[PDB]
Write a protein that binds this ligand. Structure first.
Ligand code: ZN
Ligand code: ZN
Lengths: 58, 107
């Protein structure tokens, strides 16, 4: 039984998928950021807007 | 409100005279007869918040769903991960699982 850099090496499928997922996630976060900066972010029950932004982003 | 004597600049106090209430200095003869209505509004902050809480959507706005718990295997889940104990060289996780409202919470 052995473990080698091959075992932990990212394959092509993940390499494409990550790019797409990261780009999509970064864009969505920016929009949420835009609302808090200038506008209405639905404030989640019991929380301040800043708190809400943290939750949506997380 | 603070009002101060034009003469010596100590703080005035309100007292009552023979014809009017007066602002009066404590250290000089200066007095000022209150001839007309004078007012000072503090304007405090109302307790507006009503705040309902604890909704299920407020519980499941965390990443995990459709995973596997070792107890009841249900998809609707609520996970957690910790690492802040370096005596534990293994990782630390805790999971909540509430599709059938079974409610497990284990390591
Ligand atoms: Zn005075
Ligand atoms: Zn469970």
């Amino acid at each position: 039984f052995s473990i080698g850099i091959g075992d932990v090496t990212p394959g092509q499928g993940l390499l494409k998928a990550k790019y797409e997922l990261l780009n999509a996630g970064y864009k969505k976060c920016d929009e949420y950021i835009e609302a808090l900066n200038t506008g209405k972010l639905q404030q989640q029950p019991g929380c301040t807007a800043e708190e809400t932004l943290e939750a949506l982003i997380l | 409100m603070l009002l101060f004597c034009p003469g010596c600049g100590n703080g005035l106090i309100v007292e009552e005279g023979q014809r009017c209430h007066r602002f009066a200095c404590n250290t000089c003869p200066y007095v000022h007869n209150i001839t007309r209505k004078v007012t000072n509004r503090k304007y405090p902050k109302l307790k507006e918040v009503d705040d309902v809480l604890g909704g299920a959507a407020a519980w499941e706005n965390v990443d995990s769903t459709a995973e596997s718990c070792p107890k009841c295997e249900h998809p609707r889940a609520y996970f957690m991960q910790l690492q802040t104990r370096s005596a534990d060289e293994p990782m630390t996780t805790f999971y909540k699982c509430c599709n059938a409202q079974c409610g497990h919470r284990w390591r």
